[model samples]
Target chain A: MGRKLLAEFFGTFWLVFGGCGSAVFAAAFPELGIGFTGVALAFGLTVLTMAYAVGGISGGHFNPAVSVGLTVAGRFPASSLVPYVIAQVAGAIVAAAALYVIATGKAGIDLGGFASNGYGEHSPGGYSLVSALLIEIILTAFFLIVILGSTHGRVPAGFAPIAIGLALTLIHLISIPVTNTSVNPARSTGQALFVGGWALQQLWLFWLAPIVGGAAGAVIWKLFGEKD
Target chain B: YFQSYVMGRKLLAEFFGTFWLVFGGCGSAVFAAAFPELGIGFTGVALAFGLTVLTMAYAVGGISGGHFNPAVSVGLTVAGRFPASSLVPYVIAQVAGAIVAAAALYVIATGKAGIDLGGFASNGYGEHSPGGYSLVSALLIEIILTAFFLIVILGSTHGRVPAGFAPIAIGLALTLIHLISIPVTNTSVNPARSTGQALFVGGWALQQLWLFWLAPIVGGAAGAVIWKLFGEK
Candidate 1:
């Protein structure tokens, strides 16, 4: 139990640290030029490495919505849900704070926008709130579907981590241009708490859309994914 | 059990695997990259290379041990994970296949009007380099990436790690390397791959060729040593 909690802590820490760290530091380095794609891959690789390292111990949720969705789908005990969500959020917030320190180290760097998730004028591509909602819901739903289906007993053994990780990379590839691609409430909360203003105002949508989408995904997986 | 039939089959698998990697990976960069609206970019090219290895390794790994890179072959032999007797034959087959594949890619790419080879995905630094990274950065990145690759390969295939899926881990590791370093040297941890394309690209590619070969081979060997020290019982 201790190992599992520790694994969850480390896994979630890596997710927020590596994923958001890349977005803040490396994504827009004009001289070195990592861009959106590099940031996307960095996000996925964090999950890949951590999942391989500690998946067996804690099942590698690393996200609050994942914990909730897995509970709803009956894949995990409901009693465990609160603990997992608490751990995930704690890890994400701590990671974001660490990233905040590192990012602020650069001279003349502004943490104003700071890779925070938003919609309307605050969106990177200026997407509307409704469009952001739709995209987040759809993306989160598919993220959970990949999770449930790949981790199902019938899928190939020992390859779920690769599939899950690459699915994340693919998800970001498709949607980084939309809502900065958040399928996790904890991830969104971590950055939004820092950015404030429009990001804080729009934070409710990130929480609502992903939870609804994740719940829907849990139901869908129950319907079509489970073995008889 | 030195059967000629087994040897021929292994060589053929090597040929096809190397061909698929060069064709799919380089093809993605040459054709799909920078497409008006739908360009896959360096990221896609990186994924394409990794996917080619992933798919082919799963399909044909049992036949040839999937030494798609000559550096990998040498490294495995040094680590005592592969037969030293087969090292020369494997390198010969891999290089031959890569060259032939590059030639084929050249012909296909040139078939389209006004399209140049653009060095046909040969790796380089200075002017020919994609991101204008220095020779030192290029060498450091290539060596580090290749060494890590071999480490991942050995670790994932260790007796403690899961079987039947080391290919997936190794292939994705390659993808991860490219994602990080494509802007640096266009991400070549494979010397045979660099050489095959450089042969046709000529000029600077030839002059700068030694570093790609020397670094990756040394890196792969170092990886093997590290893995033996840490992973082997």
Candidate 2:
């Protein structure tokens, strides 16, 4: 149990640190900055690399919604849900704190938004709250479906990390312009806790939509993707 | 009879795999790399290039060993995983596939009136470098990147890493290569990929083509040899 919790915590820490780190440091550097596309890749790779490294230990559920969705899918134990979420959230918070120090390390920096996820006027592309909710729910639902389906017994084994990680990448590709692309409640919470104010007020949707969407995905997967 | 039948399907897999890599990878650079404010820029092009291999490798890797690039085939052969007797045929299929894809891209790109294809995503050095990097810089980066790429390929596909995960490591390695060196030589660890685009750009791109072919093959062989020393029994 302790080993599993440690893996989840370490995985979530890398996810936020690497993913959000790219956005804060490299996403817009002068001319050759990575932009949204780079951020998307960084986020996917965080999951891809770490899952391969620690997934065997913890099943690599680095997000609260993922833990919830797997529980719904009957692939994970309900008793472990609270512990996994606690570990994941704690990891995210510590990662954000570390990122905050580094981001503020240099003088005369704005930290503008600090890579927070938001909706309505705060949306990166000025997308409305409705657009935000719809996209996040829909994307997270599909994300769960990919996770469930790829990891299903019928599919070939050992490819789950690629499919699941790239599913996150593809999710961001399609929707970063919408809600700044928060399909993971833990990822959003990590950044929001640091930004506060509007980010804090807007936090409810990030948590609510991913959990709802994740549950929906598991149900959809069970209906069609499961096997005897 | 069985050898002929099996080899035919293998060549076909190589054909389409290379086709997808060139068409999708270069196609992204031509169409979407710099589209106004939302342009995917170097990063998107890099992702597109990697996904081409990732998706197609899953689809056809078992069929032909998924050597969509000449460098990979040569490297694998050097590592004793592939046969020298088949290397020429594999490379021909790959280069042919790339050319056809480039031609298709040309039709779509030229559909608009009075458009300049510019570099058309061709590999180059000196004045043609994306960041104006010199010829030596281009050579060094491509050689080093392809060497590391082959290392990743051979290492991941080794018995130790578990099956079906090689594609992820190999594909993402390609993405990582582009992420680092796109501004240098536009990141050509694949000679066939460079040939297709160079054929269209002509002149400077053609003149610089030797390095693309030379560097990746040399690098690929070096990588395989290095792997043998460390990974082999």
Candidate 3:
């Protein structure tokens, strides 16, 4: 149990640190910036690497939404849900704080959105509040579908990490323009802390949408994705 | 998945796989990279490039052993994971797939109002380069990246790394390669991919395309040799 908690902490930390760090540090590097696409790949690889690194230990649920989705699918024990979420959220916050320190080290760099989730005026592309809600729910739901389907017993052994990780890449590909792509609450929580006010207020949608999407995915999987 | 291989199916798989590699990978850059103030940017292109292999490897890995890039096919052949007889057909299929993908992308891209074909994602260096990167810069990065790419491909697919993880390692290696060097040569470790886009951009894209082909092939051979020394007994 202790080792599993540690794994979850580290996994979530890397996801936030690598994914958000890329956006904060390199997303707009003049002519060489990585852009939304680079950040998307970074986010996916963070999960891809950590899943292979420590998935066997903690089942690789680096996001709270993932934990909830897995629980609904009966793959994770309901009892351990609180601890896992706590660990995951804590890891993200600490990572954000660390990133804040490093980013501030730069000479007067402002973190505008700080990669925080938003809607209305705060949306990266001026997407409406309703658009934010719709995209988040849809993207997160499909994310769960990919996760559940890829991890089912019928799929070939050891390919879940690849599919799940790339599913994340695909999710970001489609939705980064919508809400800077927050299918993971832990990811959103990590970025919203420093850029409070608007970010804090908008945080509710990131949390609510993904959770609902996860449940939707769970029900979808239960109906048609069972391999046995 | 590796238990059977049909000549026609294998070639077709390689063809379609490479097609998706170029289509989704380059297609994202063409369609989404420069969309108003919310562009996907080079990073998005990099992720798109990686996902091409990630998605296709899982899709057709069983049929063709999934070498969607010409350099990958060359590397596997040098490493003895693939046969020499199939090289010509595989390379031909890969190149054809890339060209066809570029054509499809061109048609779709032109549908957008005021879209400029410009380079069409054709890779180059110096004046034609995305960042004015020198030819040497392009060559050095391509060789180094392809070497590492082949190493990851061999290492991850080895008996030691376990099954079903090769695509992840291989695909992400391509992603990392792009992240490291997209500003230089637009990062081409695949000859077929380079050839596909170059044909559309022509002129400078075509003239500079030679280096894109040479560096990756050389680096791939070097990688196979390195794998022989370390990855295998």
Candidate 4:
């Protein structure tokens, strides 16, 4: 249990650190910036690298929504859920703080959005709340479907990380313009806590949408993907 | 059963795989890399290039071993993982697929009026290099990247690492290589990719084509030997 929690901590730490760090540090660095696509790839590679590094220890559920989805699918125990979420969220917050320090080291720098998840005026593309809700739910639902399907016994082992990670990348590719792409609540929480104000007020949708979408995906998987 | 029939299917697989590699990778550079404010830029171009292989490898890897690049086919043959007898056919199929895709891209890329073909995503060095890198810089980077590419391909597909993961490693390795060297030589770890774009650009692109061909093939062969020394028992 101790080792598993530690693995979850480090996994979520890398997720928040690498993904948001790229958004804050490199997404718009003048003429040769990484932009949305690079940020999306960075987010995906964080999950891919860490999953390969420590998946066997904690199953690599670095997101609170993923923990809930796995619980619904009976792949994770209900009793362990709280501990895992606590560890995951904590890891994200700590990573964000670490990134905050470096991002502010330069003189007279502004974080702008700080890569927070939001809607209406705060959304990256000024998308409305309903649009944010719809995209987040649909994308996170598919994210879980890919996670469960790729990890199922029918599919080959060791490929789940690739599929899941790239699914996140694909999700971001499609929806980053919508809500800065928040299929994981821990990811959103890590960023929003720093931005506060409007970000905090809009944070509910990030948590609500992904958890509902994740649970719905697992239920769909049980109906069609499970072996009889 | 006719052996030629089996070989024909493999050739077709290589054809479409290389087609996707060029069409997706270079097509993104031409169409989306600088689309005004929201352009994907170099990083997006890199991802587009990597995802091309990642998606196609799964789709066609089993049928043709997914050697979408001539350099890959040569490297595998040198490593004893593929047959030397089939190398020429595989290279021919890959290069043909690449050229066809480049022609297709040329048609679409020229759709807009007042558009310049520019480099057409052709690989180059010296004054033509994206970052003004010299000829030696171009040669060294291509050779080293291709070598590491083969090393990752060989190591990931070895019996020890988990099965069905080589595509991820190999595909993302291409992405990482592009991320590092796109500014250097516009990145030519695959000769087929370079040839595809060069045919359309011509002029200096053709003059500098020899380095792209020489470096990747040399690097691919060297990588195979390195893997034999370190990766194998």
Candidate 5:
């Protein structure tokens, strides 16, 4: 259990650090900095790499939304839920602070919303609040579906990380223009904490929608896979 | 199954797989990469490139070992994982697939209003380079990155790593490579990928195509050699 918590912590930490770090430091750098597409790949690779490193120990639930989804799907123990969520959130905050320090190293660096997820005025593409809620729910639901289905016994086991990771990439490919692509609440929370003010104000949807969507996905998976 | 069947099927698989790689990868850069406001951008182009490998490798890895790149076939042969006898056929199939894919992409790219070709996402160095990197910079990065790409592919596909995980590691290795090097020679560890675009872009792209083939094959052989020393039991 301790190792599980440690793995979860490190996994969440890598997710925020690598994913948001790319958005903050590289997405808009002059000429050579990776763009939105690069940031999207960064986020996916963090999961793909970490899953290889720590997935076997902890089941690799790097997001609170994922933990909750697995819990509902009967893949994770309900007793372990609180500790896992705490570790994930803690890792995200710690990672965000680390990224902030690195980002501020350069002089005259504009924060530029600091890669925070939001809606209305703060959304990257001016997507409305309903649009934010809707996209988050839809994408997160699909994310859990990919996770649950890819890991199912009927599906090949070792390939889950690839399918699940690329599913994140595919989700981002479609939706980065919308809610900045947050199927992971821990990720959304980390960037919002640093951005403050408006980000903090609009942070609730990032949490609520993912939780709902995650549970919805679990229920859908139960219907689709567990008929025995 | 493939070893038992005609090598012809394996070559066909390589053809389709490489065709899909160029069609998906170069096509994304041309069609979606810079489309007005909602452009997919360099990042999307990177994922597009990686996903083409990830998806196609799964579809045809067993059939052909999924060496959609000419350099990859050469690397695998040098590493002793592939038979040298089949090398020419594999390279020929890969290049043919890429050329056809580039042709299909050209038709689609030109379909747009006010199309300017924009190098058609071809690899290049110096003034024609996407980031204006020098020829030396292009050559060095291609060699180093292709070496690492081969290392990742070989390491992840080795019997020690869990089965079915190779595609993810190899595919993401590609994503990582593009993330680091897209601005430098537009990221061509695959000479087939390079030649596909060069043939269409012509002039400087065609002139610069030799390095793409030379550097990647050199790097691929180096990677296989390194993996043999470090990875083999």
Candidate 6:
């Protein structure tokens, strides 16, 4: 149990450090020319690497929504949900702090809102609040379906991590233009807590929408998946 | 019964895998490569190729060794990893799948507004090269990258490495290869991928198609030899 918590901590830490790190440093860097696609790939690779490293220990629930959704689906115990969420949030906050320190290293670097999740005015592409809510819900639902389906016992064993990780990559490819692509509340909250202002004001939508969508997905899978 | 099913499954897996490689990959470069306001760009096309293989490889790898590439089949033959009797069938299935996928992509791509199928991500050099790289440079890079790809595949799948993670390592290697070389020859280390797109692209792509086949095959064979010399028993 201790090892599982520790694995969750490390995995979430890598998730923010690598995914948000690329967004802050590499994605916009004109010298290297990484752009939006590179940021998407970076996010995927972080999960890919960490899932291989620690998935066995923690079941690789780096996201609060994933932990919650799995609990709802009965694959994970409800008793451990709070502990997993606490650990994941703690890890994400720490990673964001680290990213903040590194990002401020440049002489005149401004955080430029620091990769915080938002809709309407703060949204990356100026998407409306309703649009943001719809996109996040649909994307999270699909994300959970891929997760539950790929990790189901009938799907090939030992390949769930790859499928799930790349499913994430594909998800980002499709939806990064809308809502900056947050299927996980932890990911949204980590940066929002730091960036404050509009991000804090609009953060509720990210939380409410994704959790609702994720839980709904879990229930749908419960109805559809093969049972023992 | 299991053995017979496995054999049939392996051939079918090759067909589907190769079909996906051409369809999703070449299709991305053909149709979506230049879309306004959110074009996937070279980077996305690169990722599209890698993901097609990554997804399908995991889906079917248990039944087959997942040698969707003809070079992979030949390399395995050279390494004594696969039987010679099965190579021809595998290659034929792979080519057939690729051609079928090319046709599908062609039909679908013409549905969009104001689209030209000019070259359609075909592998080539001189005039047709994306970066205008010379033939020698194209050949050398193709051989080197494919050799390294084989190395990554062989090393990751070697008996000592962890089981069931070979596809992940190999798939990402393909992504990394495209990350580096999409500007050069549009990055075709697989002859089937090259041939599929070339059938639609024509002209120089047709004349230069042999290089794509020859370089990767020879490079794959060399990878087998090198792996045997350095590590394989």
Point to the candidate with the largest TM-score: 1
Candidate 6: list runs displaced more than 4 Å.
A1-159, A171-228, B1-5, B36-38
Compared with the true structure, what per-residue lDDT tens digits does model 5 show for residues A1-228? 877787688678767866776677557756446777777777887687567545766788899899999999999999999999999998999888866765554446687788888788887899999998888888888899999888888885677777877778788778887888888888888888988898899888888999999999999989987555
Local distance difference test values of all predictions, in order: 0.77, 0.83, 0.81, 0.82, 0.81, 0.77
Chain B TM-score for candidate 6: 0.94
B51-154: candidate 3 lDDT, tens digit per residue: 77876666556567888978888998999888878889999999999998888666544433364767888888899778898888888888889988988888
Tens digit of lDDT per residue, candidate 4, span A1-228? 876787688678767866786677557766766778877887787677556545656788999999999999998999999999999999999878866765554446787778898899988888999999988888887888898899888887788878888888888889999999898888899888998988889899999999999998889888898665
What C-alpha lDDT, on a 0 to 100 scale, does residue A19 get in candidate 1?
76
Recovered fraction of real interface contacts per model: 0.06, 0.07, 0.18, 0.13, 0.14, 0.08
| Candidate 1 lDDT, B1-233, residue by residue in tens | 24434788998888888888888888787788667777876667777898888898998887888878988998887788888888888888888888988888888877788866676788987676675656876776677567767766665666655777767777776776676666567778888888888899899999999988988898899878855754454
Model 1 ranges off by over 4 Å = A1-38, A49-156, A163-228, B1-5, B159-163
* lDDT (Cα, tens digit) per residue for candidate 6, span B188-221: 8899889988887777888999999998898888
lDDT of 5 at A117: 83
Superposed model 4: Cα runs more than 4 Å off: A1-30, A35-228, B1-5
Candidates sorted by lDDT, best first: 2, 4, 5, 3, 1, 6
In the range A1-228, model 6's lDDT, one tens digit per residue, is 889899999999998888888889877676664665666677778787888899988899898888888888888999999999888888889999999988888899889878777776776555567767765775566467556755766555667777777856655554454566788888888898999888889888978888887888787656544242
Segments of candidate 2 deviating more than 4 angstroms: A1-32, A36-228, B1-5
Q: What DockQ, on C-alphas, does every prediction get?
A: 0.10, 0.07, 0.11, 0.08, 0.10, 0.09
Total backbone clashes of model 2?
A: 0
A1-228 per-residue lDDT for model 1 (tens digits): 656666577568667766786676546645444688787887787677566645766788988778878888899998888888888888888777866765554446667777778888877888888998998888878888888898888876677788788788888888787788888888888888888778889889888988888888899988988756
Clashes found in each candidate (C-alpha, N, C closer than 3 A): 0, 0, 4, 0, 3, 0
Question: lDDT by residue for model 3 over A1-228, one digit each (tens)?
Answer: 999999999999999999999989998888888777677778889988999999989999898888898889888899999999999999999999999999999998988888898876887656667767766775576577666756665457677777778868766775665578898898899889888899999999999999998878777556544424
Clashing pairs in 2: none
TM-score of 2: 0.57
* Weakest ten-residue segment in model 1 chain B by summed lDDT: B224-233
Candidates in descending DockQ order:
3, 1, 5, 6, 4, 2
Error of 2 at B211 (Å): 0.8
